[PDB]
């Protein structure tokens, strides 16, 4: 009578104190948008980042207000870089055999969008029984 998601949807990973601290930091500190200079001034100029090269570029020259320039200093903490916001490290899965070797305590699985419903169903029931959470679950009316 209602929609419910298959699998261990509420499952949380178990992290060392330090990893939970750094994950919390990443989430608190965040980062600037880092969109290309003046992308907002011209429709033909997209948001995708490009190093400002103009000799007189205000952003290139680092004038406060012209947006931050990509630098290694903005990198996220090594120990948490790339983790899903839940804390899980993601594993791209295309079939059932891809579930093999996956630790449901540390990793959550993400079924490629291209995978069909039939194959997803098997992958989903096989992941739940393996204790692995599926980040993009199928919602069925139960």
Partner RNA sequence: ACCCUCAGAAGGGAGGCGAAAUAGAGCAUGAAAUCAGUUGGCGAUCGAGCGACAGGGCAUACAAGGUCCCUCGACGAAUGACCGACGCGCGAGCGUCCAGUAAGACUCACGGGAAGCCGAUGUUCUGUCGUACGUUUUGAAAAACGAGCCAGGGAGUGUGUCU
Partner RNA sequence: CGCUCUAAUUGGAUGGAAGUAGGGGUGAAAACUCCUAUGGACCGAUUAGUGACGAAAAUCCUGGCCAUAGUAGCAGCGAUA
Partner RNA sequence: UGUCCCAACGUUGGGCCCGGUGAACUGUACAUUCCAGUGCGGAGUCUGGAGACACCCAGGGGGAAGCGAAGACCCUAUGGA
Chain positions contacting Sr ion, by CB under 5 A: 113
Which residue, 37 or 102, is less far from Mg ion as judged by CB? 37
Is residue 35 part of the contact set for RNA (CB under 7 A)?
Answer: yes
From 14, 16, 30, 141, residue interacting with RNA (rule: CB under 7 A): 30
From 8, 19, 76, 105, residue interacting with RNA (rule: CB under 7 A): 76
CB 78 within 8 A of CB 19: no
Q: In sequence order, which residues have a C-beta less than 8 Å from that of residue 43 and are 6 or more positions away? A: none
* 58-62 contacts, C-beta under 8 A, 24 or more apart: none
Which residue, 69 or 136, is less far from Sr ion as judged by CB? 136
CB 128 within 8 A of CB 102: no
Is residue 101 part of the contact set for RNA (CB under 7 A)?
Answer: no
From 8, 19, 91, 95, residue interacting with RNA (rule: CB under 7 A): 95
Is residue 80 part of the contact set for RNA (CB under 7 A)?
Answer: yes
Q: Give the pairing of strands 3-5 and 139-141.
A: antiparallel
């Amino acid at each position: 009578t209602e929609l419910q998601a298959r699998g261990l949807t509420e499952k949380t990973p178990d992290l060392s104190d330090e990893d939970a601290r750094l994950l919390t930091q990443r989430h608190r500190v965040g980062k600037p948008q880092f969109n290309r200079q003046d992308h907002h001034k011209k429709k033909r100029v997209s948001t995708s980042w490009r190093k400002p090269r103009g000799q007189l570029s205000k952003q290139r020259r680092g004038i406060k207000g012209k947006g931050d320039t990509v630098e290694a200093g903005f990198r996220s903490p090594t120990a948490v870089r790339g983790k899903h916001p839940s804390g899980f490290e993601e594993v791209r899965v295309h079939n059932v055999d891809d579930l093999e070797g996956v630790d449901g305590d540390t990793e959550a699985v993400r079924i490629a969008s291209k995978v069909g419903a039939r194959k997803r169903e098997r992958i989903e029931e096989e992941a739940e029984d393996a204790g692995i959470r599926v980040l993009n679950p199928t919602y069925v009316e139960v």
